[PDB]
Design a protein around this ligand. Structure first.
Ligand SMILES: CCCCCCCCCCCCCCCCCC(=O)OC[C@H](CO[C@@H]1O[C@H](CO[C@H]2O[C@H](CO)[C@H](O)[C@H](O)[C@H]2O)[C@H](O)[C@H](O)[C@H]1O)OC(=O)CCCCCCCCCCCCCCCCC
Ligand code: CLA
Ligand code: CLA
Ligand code: CLA
Ligand SMILES: C=Cc1c(C)c2cc3nc(c4c5[nH]c(cc6nc(cc1[nH]2)C(C)=C6CC)c(C)c5C(=O)[C@@H]4C(=O)OC)[C@@H](CCC(=O)OC/C=C(\C)CCC[C@H](C)CCC[C@H](C)CCCC(C)C)[C@@H]3C
Ligand SMILES: CC(C)=CCC/C(C)=C/CC/C(C)=C/CC/C(C)=C/CC/C(C)=C/CC/C(C)=C/CC/C(C)=C/CC/C(C)=C/CC/C(C)=C/CC1=CC(=O)C(C)=C(C)C1=O
Ligand SMILES: CCCCCCCCCCCCCCCCCC(=O)OC[C@H](CO[C@@H]1O[C@H](CO)[C@H](O)[C@H](O)[C@H]1O)OC(=O)CCCCCCCCCCCCCCCCC
Ligand SMILES: CCCCCCCCCCCCCCCC(=O)OC[C@H](CO[C@@H]1O[C@H](CS(=O)(=O)O)[C@@H](O)[C@H](O)[C@H]1O)OC(=O)CCCCCCCCCCCCCCC
Ligand SMILES: CCCCCCCCCCCCCCCC(=O)OC[C@H](COP(=O)(O)OC[C@@H](O)CO)OC(=O)CCCCCCCCCCCCCCC
Ligand SMILES: CCCCCCCCCCCCCCCC(=O)OC[C@H](COP(=O)(O)OC[C@@H](O)CO)OC(=O)CCCCCCCCCCCCCCC
Ligand SMILES: CC1=C(/C=C/C(C)=C/C=C/C(C)=C/C=C/C=C(C)/C=C/C=C(C)/C=C/C2=C(C)CCCC2(C)C)C(C)(C)CCC1
Ligand code: OEY
Ligand SMILES: [Cl-]
Ligand SMILES: [Cl-]
Lengths: 34, 37, 334, 81, 38, 33, 65, 30, 34, 341, 36, 36, 32, 36, 30
């Protein structure tokens, strides 16, 4: 018996979801060439 | 008419005197160059 | 009862108002020599040819200086790293012109301050303390060594040691930035984190203890009289401090162990300042801040400036103006 | 101590890694595409390596008007087209 | 009279309003379903 | 040097007035115990 | 305490210390004036800032004539 | 006069040091 | 344009996948809320 | 038992991250300032406002990336997304500097929210609100530097840009143009920040080396208990130590920890005041007496005159690229330069 | 100058030997707890 | 419930960071931002 | 008027110093 | 070892008034001569 | 400056007068 969705859950994913997305964009960038 | 009952003694201990004088002397040492300009 | 043994007992006595100690035996004379020479030079030294080009800079009060502009001026670049005691000069007039006092002061100070740190070890042993307060002070002490000794050695001149003055200090930090790009150097960035962070945690800890002081007084008296020197009980509520701070952030980012909290308080600024002292000490060997000048170019090869390039334009303005008369050749290699 | 499930116990749970072994690479790939497709350039108005200057230009296309600024950068961008 | 920037103003005003009320519509709801006992 | 002549009085008063105040409060504190 | 002629005249103006209207009283209405005043300060600010631009409002010294 | 002023203030600080150390309120236990 | 589906598609599948693995437990938590 | 009270109940529940009424201002504004900075530093240029690249997308790294200030031609425009400049166009808004005002204003309201949080939690827990009070110093710095300074200037352009190297540039601007190191309010700030770091280190070290032996192990951390009444280190031994080493020592734990609040908070407050002066170019640039002497006496040289030459180099060498809107063209022959360099 | 140089040589050597011999005189034993 | 041992989570998480950060440093030398 | 500008400081101190002496002695008298 | 010759010192209000009048009036008299 | 100084001293004395009359040590009959 633990809740799954909490205020905590939300604050966590507020930050973590775009972090990973941003990391993936920044990963693609190392291969951009002029 | 009574004497005013709100009156209170004031204190400044010796350490607070030393701290306060240092503050003032160091402030004076810092700003005096700007006051003389 | 023997003479030497009674002397030894007075040197190491824990009953002297100020502890002397064997480190004190060297500290006291050397700090007195450095202090006395410093005070006299700051007030009355004549101008000193810092950069060896027969262009004396006036640093003392009687020669037209104020508290902000005055300094003891570093010795002549013509001396470089040569030792220049008084008795190596034909006369005091020569010694003054070439910046002798700077050398006397810095050597005695560095020695005396080194012994200051040892003295901290020593009394802690005489008192049955743990021994590492001196390790905390090695961080400032290293910093002083870096700007008065290490940076001259690597550059070859006490003329580039840090001046003993308020504006002299600023002249040193401006030239350092132009010759080493210290702001883009990570060890300097760690110093700033050590110093910003240290002030932050000072404020935090002082505000957190102060917030949780246990009521022992009335509103008409200083809360400070709620603590009596030597009392055995603690004078704030650390669990109340933890319960506020843990909720301000979250529980596990807060300290409930005062020993870990206070050791964190010690280590954060000490380690930041070791690094920033290391920074000066390694830029002394010209391993300089990151250089990203023209690192962004476009498809054609045009330079696309960044903020690093703007910084570089400032550094360039410092470079070309510093010591405007001293360079005859196009590269300032030291 | 507050009644949420402990983090330690979540990131060792099989169920957790079953979801996040999908959600974490999907977001990483998602962000990759945002760049690899060029969408990030167009959303944000960021120049591509080839669109900072026009060919023989060495003039910054610097905004110089407050209420006509939108129209200025629009003009600078056609000076490339 | 009624200029672009005044329309923009009203746009901003209603967006802020939407945002704050929706925020409080959510907060008021959760606080009703998940009450403290006593 | 061609320095601001009022600098002196400013500095003197800047030192004297706040210091005298602290001394006044210390000495009368001591005359109590 | 000393009574004075003027004291007796002003008396009832300092006589209701601690008296309150029950519950929330006029708070809802206060909130309306507060919200109106905010929007109005917004407008005044955005006029001065020139992000609210209005016909016949020339925010310039050249509006002295 | 500016030199006299600067040195005077510094001199006062040094004397203050003397009293702060050797004529401190002596800390007393419990 | 079309790149927006490329970009969003993985995150929907991530949301989809996670929707399906957690749904049974997420409904037990809502029941407990009276 | 009305709705307002019910919401109070829910806002103030003990949970992993406490929310509070102040959470309503804090969390959206903190998340948005932070996300604005990570969005701009990853994807948004400064080409049209500054002639600079400033994102990862463009090839910058963590040190050189920034969210740059708006163009000088924007004045102190709020640069609202829906305002007359951007006209609702997200893209142009990004290109004109809209994220700078977004971050700065949401940051401001976040800071307010954070200080309201310190007030809110302190009331609920029953402690004095000295941690909030302390936090007034960060606030003072932020408003003075990021809001008041540029509001006194020609535009937001001259505020700090939100980035590592951009702030380094802001430091050097202030040296060359304001001679900020010469400013006694900055000096009092330096003494408060360095004084604070000293206090932090010296206090932590003193406690760690006056510890009582309360356990058998060589790791002394185990031997503290958060609810113990007894002090965990000897104030008495600490005081005798410092009295004998330094001459003075603390004897009052309360005063000691208040001083630790006082020193860095005041230093920051002093520096804020000086930056308010610089909003108006109200500088401690010069010492008049030195200039009159040096104008007349070409042999008179101090570190003060030496440093102004440096400021003069800085201004002339950085100004054209740092203030592109001014179209400064300094031909070679007008640049100040010493011999050879 | 040479008078000065000799004097400083003497003063420094004196203090340095106080230091060397002072620490050679059973320094570990001068503590409050356990003496050897 | 506690199936994956935590030390394993730490190592794989650990190497995941090293990988991405290493890519960012590789990219300091290649492509945009490399000076070339 | 071309007066001696050390006269301001001499007059100022002539008043301040002895008056402060007097005040210090009176106030500590009143508190005992 | 406290010293037995310590004495308390006094200045009543009237003496303060008289002393302050003296100083103030001396100042008003000499100041003209100080400014010259 | 000299006028201000003469006027200030004169004004201090008038204020001394007021305190010395109205805030005197009251004479009382021991
Ligand atoms: C402490 C706790 C902190 C808590 C604070 C929480 C955050 C609150 C956020 C508030 C945001 C404030 C927005 C300010 C915008 C601003 O000012 O915007 C500036 C505008 C005025 O705009 C400027 O006006 C200037 C003068 O123009 C005038 O002069 C020109 C030349 O003559 C022409 O004639 C022109 O037409 C005429 O209008 C220039 O043109 C600038 O380019 C233009 O931006 O003021 C206006 O919006 C309004 C100005 C008056 C309102 C008072 C402002 C108070 C803030 C300033 C106080 C510090 C004082 C700074 C001085 C140092
Ligand atoms: C916000 C901006 C900022 C910040 C926070 C800092 C912060 C810092 N800088 Mg950087 N710096 C900046 C901007 C900034 N800088 C800029 C713009 C430039 C370029 C112009 C530089 C250039 C620069 C240089 C060139 C140097 C620094 C250094 C430092 C450090 C100084 C503190 C120190 O050395 O403590 C250490 C402590 C001491 C130095 C003091 C030791 C004290 C001794 C041991 C005892 C003294 C006793 C005394 C004489 C008597 C007292 C007793 C009493 C009775 C009188 C610190 C990390 C310095 C550094 O890293 O040095 C190591 C350094 O050399 N900075
Ligand atoms: C709740 C916290 C919060 C706060 C304090 C702010 C504060 C701010 N935001 Mg941010 N914002 C927030 C949350 C917040 N925002 C959220 C959740 C989002 C995501 C959607 C955003 C997205 C966002 C953007 C995209 C922008 C801002 C901007 C701004 C600034 C201007 C706001 C403005 O002009 O208001 C105007 C509106 C109000 C003050 C509303 C007042 C409400 C009144 C009292 C009620 C009116 C009711 C209505 C008229 C009646 C009904 C009408 C009828 C038809 C029935 C300001 C600093 C702008 C900015 O930073 O510019 C650089 C900007 O461009 N915000
Ligand atoms: C000995 C070196 C030294 C030292 C110690 C200082 C110390 C200081 N300088 Mg000075 N400086 C120096 C050298 C130095 N300076 C030199 C040589 C120069 C060249 C002229 C300057 C130029 C300079 C400028 C130009 C400025 C200073 C300022 C300051 C102050 C900064 C206070 C602060 O914490 O701001 C830090 C900022 C804040 C506390 C604001 C709020 C921060 C909030 C809480 C941020 C929260 C972050 C959030 C959680 C997000 C985190 C995540 C994100 C990182 C990803 C401080 C007194 C500033 C000042 O005086 O301000 C009034 C300033 O503007 N300095
Ligand atoms: C650069 C130095 C510096 C930073 C980064 C910093 C940071 C912080 N200080 C805090 C606290 C404090 N700071 C204090 C004293 C001090 N703080 C100082 C200096 C700093 N303090 C100094 C020198 C002192 C001594 C007086 C106190 C007393 C406290 C606290 O109590 C508090 C804390 O809990 O400490 C543990 C925290 C407040 C958290 C918060 O508001 O979250 C909410 C986040 C918000 C509202 C967003 C703000 C966004 C900012 C303002 C603009 C955007 C910033 C960008 C995203 C990042 C840009 C970075 C580039 C510029 C490089 C935060 C970690
Ligand atoms: C010959 C001539 C004339 C000489 C000229 C020389 C010269 C150049 C002089 C220049 C001087 C100059 C003008 C200096 C200017 C300095 C200046 C900027 C002043 C700052 C002004 C100001 C008010 C700033 C505001 C910020 C401010 C409040 C900072 C205060 C900094 C400060 C005092 C911090 C404390 C530092 C300090 C060393 C404290 C030590 C504390 C100590 C005793 C702790 C030991 C200890 C620790 C424990 O943990 C426990 C438990 C115990 C018990 C204990 O004891
Ligand atoms: C709970 C869930 C967890 C919460 C997740 C929330 C985390 C968000 C925090 C944001 C961190 C901001 C750092 C971003 C750095 C990054 O992206 O670099 C991304 C860049 C990408 O690298 C650049 O890529 C470009 C692509 O065109 C070019 O190739 C450049 O040459 C190359 O440098 O990496 C670096 O510059 C090199 C590594 C340096 C990394 C920064 C060191 C760490 C700094 C500390 C972080 C700041 C905190 C300060 C604390 C004091
Ligand atoms: C453009 C406009 C955009 C702006 C709009 C922004 C909307 C803001 C809304 C923010 C509120 C989010 C928190 C609620 C989420 C949720 O999981 O809680 C309600 C449920 C939580 O579960 C419960 O969790 C509870 C713990 S707690 O309250 O979440 O801490 C527990 O008590 C209970 O047993 C359990 O079932
Ligand atoms: C640097 C200061 C801290 C030094 C470390 C030591 C402090 C010790 C802590 C208390 C006593 C010891 C507890 C032991 C345990 C220990 O010290 O910590 C470990 C702890 C793990 O907690 P769990 O609940 O998983 O397990 C309980 C553990 O205590 C088991 O040992 O870490 C977490 O809290 C992870 C959450 C961080 C991720 C949260 C991200 C989301 C935050 C978003 C909200 C933003 C912040 C708020 C905005 C204002
Ligand atoms: C062998 C050589 C040893 C080195 C000798 C150095 C002597 C100088 C030491 C300080 C004496 C003056 C401190 C007076 C003040 C004084 O006596 O304080 C005494 C005070 C005692 O504190 P307590 O906790 O006992 O008192 C608090 C309550 O009891 C009273 O409210 O100490 C502190 O507050 C510690 C922090 C003060 C730290 C201030 C030190 C800063 C000194 C440096 C400033 C120099 C600028 C000079 C520029 C020219
Ligand atoms: C702006 C805007 C907005 C919002 C936005 C947002 C909110 C976003 C977010 C964002 C975010 C949220 C992001 C994130 C990112 C992240 C990152 C990118 C990270 C990174 C990091 C890293 C890289 C790290 C690493 C490391 C290192 C380097 C060293 C140490 C260790 C570690 C691991 C830490 C909106 C919509 C309203 C609209 C308007 C505009
Ligand atoms: O930085 Mn530039 O480099 Ca080191 O020397 Mn060559 O000039 Mn000169 O003497 Mn001092 O200073
Ligand atoms: Cl120079
Ligand atoms: Cl050369």
């Amino acid at each position: 018996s633990y809740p799954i969705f909490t205020v905590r859950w939300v604050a966590v994913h507020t930050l973590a979801v775009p972090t990973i997305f941003f990391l993936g964009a920044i990963a693609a960038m190392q291969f951009i060439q002029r | 008419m009574e004497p005013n009952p709100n009156r209170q003694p004031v204190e400044l201990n010796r350490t607070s005197l030393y701290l306060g004088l240092l503050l003032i002397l160091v402030l004076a040492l810092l700003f005096s160059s700007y006051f003389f300009n | 009862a023997n003479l030497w043994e009674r002397f030894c007992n007075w040197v190491t006595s824990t009953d002297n108002r100020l502890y002397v100690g064997w480190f004190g035996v060297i500290m006291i004379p050397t700090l007195l020599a450095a202090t006395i020479c410093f005070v006299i030079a700051f007030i009355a030294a004549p101008p000193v040819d810092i950069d060896g080009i027969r262009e004396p800079v006036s640093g003392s009060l009687l020669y037209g200086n104020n508290i902000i502009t005055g300094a003891v001026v570093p010795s002549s670049n013509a001396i470089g790293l040569h030792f220049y005691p008084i008795w190596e000069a034909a006369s005091l007039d020569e010694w003054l012109y070439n910046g002798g006092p700077y050398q006397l002061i810095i050597f005695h100070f560095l020695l005396g301050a080194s012994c200051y740190m040892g003295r901290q070890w020593e009394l802690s042993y005489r008192l049955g303390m743990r021994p590492w307060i001196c390790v905390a002070y090695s961080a400032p002490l290293a910093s002083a060594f870096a700007v008065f000794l290490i940076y001259p050695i690597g550059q070859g001149s006490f003329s580039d040691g840090m001046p003993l003055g308020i504006s002299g200090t600023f002249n040193f930090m401006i030239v350092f930035q132009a010759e080493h790009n210290i702001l883009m150097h990570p060890f300097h960035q760690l110093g700033v984190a050590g110093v910003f962070g240290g002030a932050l945690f000072c404020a935090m800890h002082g505000s957190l203890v102060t917030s949780s002081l246990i009521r022992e007084t009335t509103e008409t008296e200083s809360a400070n009289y709620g603590y009596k020197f030597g009392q055995e009980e603690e004078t704030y509520n650390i669990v109340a401090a933890h319960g506020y701070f843990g909720r301000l952030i979250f529980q596990y980012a807060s300290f409930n162990n005062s020993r870990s909290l206070h050791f964190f308080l010690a280590a954060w600024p000490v380690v930041g300042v070791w690094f920033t002292a290391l920074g000066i000490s390694t830029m002394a060997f010209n391993l300089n801040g990151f250089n990203f000048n023209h690192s962004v170019i476009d498809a054609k090869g045009n330079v696309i400036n960044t903020w690093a390039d703007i910084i570089n334009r400032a550094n360039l303005g410092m470079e070309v103006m510093h010591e405007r008369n001293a360079h005859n050749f196009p590269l300032d290699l030291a | 101590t507050t009644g949420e499930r402990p983090f330690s116990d979540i990131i060792t749970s099989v169920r957790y890694w079953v979801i996040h072994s999908i959600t974490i690479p999907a977001l990483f790939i998602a962000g990759w595409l945002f760049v690899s497709t060029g969408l990030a350039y167009d959303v944000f108005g960021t120049p591509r390596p080839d669109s900072y200057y026009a060919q023989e230009q060495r003039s910054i296309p610097l905004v110089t008007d407050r209420f006509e600024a939108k129209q200025q950068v629009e003009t600078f961008l056609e000076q490339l087209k | 009279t009624i200029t672009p920037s005044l329309k923009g103003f009203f746009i901003g005003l209603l967006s802020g309003a939407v945002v704050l009320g929706l925020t409080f519509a959510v907060l008021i709801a959760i606080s009703q379903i998940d009450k403290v006992q006593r | 040097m061609e320095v601001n002549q009022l600098g002196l009085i400013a500095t003197a008063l800047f030192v004297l007035v706040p210091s005298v105040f602290l001394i006044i409060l210390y000495v009368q504190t001591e005359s109590q115990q | 305490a000393r009574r004075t002629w003027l004291g007796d005249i002003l008396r009832p103006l300092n006589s209701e210390y601690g008296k309150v209207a029950p519950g929330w009283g006029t708070t809802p209405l206060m909130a309306v004036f507060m919200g109106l005043f905010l929007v109005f300060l917004l407008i005044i600010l955005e006029i001065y800032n020139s992000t609210l631009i209005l016909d016949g409002v020339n925010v310039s010294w050249k509006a002295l004539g | 006069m500016e030199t006299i002023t600067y040195v005077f203030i510094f001199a006062c600080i040094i004397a203050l040091f003397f009293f702060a150390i050797f004529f401190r309120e002596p800390p007393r236990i419990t | 344009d079309w790149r927006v589906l490329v970009v969003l598609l993985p995150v929907l599948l991530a949301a989809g996948w996670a929707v399906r693995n957690i749904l049974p437990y997420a409904v037990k938590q809502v029941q407990k809320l009276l | 038992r009305g709705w307002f009270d019910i919401l109070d109940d829910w806002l103030k529940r003990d949970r992993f991250v406490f929310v509070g009424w102040s959470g309503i201002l804090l969390f959206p504004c903190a998340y948005l300032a932070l996300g604005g900075w990570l969005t701009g530093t990853t994807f948004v240029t400064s080409w049209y406002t500054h002639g600079l690249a400033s994102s990862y997308l463009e090839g910058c790294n963590f040190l050189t990336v920034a969210v740059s200030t708006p163009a000088n031609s924007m004045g102190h425009s709020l640069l609202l997304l829906w305002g007359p400049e951007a006209q609702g166009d997200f893209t142009r808004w990004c290109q004109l500097g809209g994220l700078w005002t977004f971050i700065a204003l949401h940051g401001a309201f976040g800071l307010i929210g954070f200080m309201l949080r310190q007030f809110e939690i302190a009331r609920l827990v029953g402690v004095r609100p000295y941690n909030a009070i302390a936090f007034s110093a960060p606030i003072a710095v932020f408003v003075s530097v990021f809001l008041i300074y540029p509001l006194g200037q020609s535009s937001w352009f001259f505020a700090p840009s939100f980035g590592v190297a951009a702030i380094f540039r802001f430091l050097l601007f202030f040296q060359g143009f304001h001679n900020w190191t010469l400013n006694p309010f900055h000096m009092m700030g330096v003494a408060g920040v360095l004084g604070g770091a000293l206090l932090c280190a010296i206090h932590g070290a003193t406690v760690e080396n006056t510890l009582f032996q309360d356990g058998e192990g060589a790791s002394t951390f185990r031997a503290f208990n958060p609810t113990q009444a007894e002090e965990t280190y000897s104030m008495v031994t600490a005081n005798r130590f410092w009295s004998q080493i330094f001459g003075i020592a603390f004897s009052n734990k309360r005063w000691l920890h208040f001083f630790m609040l006082f020193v860095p908070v005041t230093g920051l407050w002093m520096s804020a005041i000086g930056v308010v002066g610089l909003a108006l170019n109200l500088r401690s640039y010069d010492f008049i007496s030195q200039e009159i002497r040096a104008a007349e006496d070409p042999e008179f040289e101090t570190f003060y005159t030496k440093n102004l030459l440096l400021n003069e180099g800085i201004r002339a060498w950085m100004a054209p690229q740092d203030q592109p809107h001014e179209n400064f063209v300094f031909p070679e022959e007008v640049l100040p330069r010493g011999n050879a360099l | 100058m040479e008078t000065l140089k000799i004097t400083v040589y003497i003063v420094v050597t004196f203090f340095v030997l106080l230091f060397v011999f002072g620490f050679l005189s059973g320094d570990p034993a001068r503590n409050p707890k356990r003496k050897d | 419930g506690g199936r994956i041992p935590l030390w394993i989570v730490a190592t794989v998480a650990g190497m995941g960071v090293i990988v991405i950060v290493g890519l960012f440093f590789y990219g300091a030398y290649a492509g945009l931002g490399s000076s070339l």
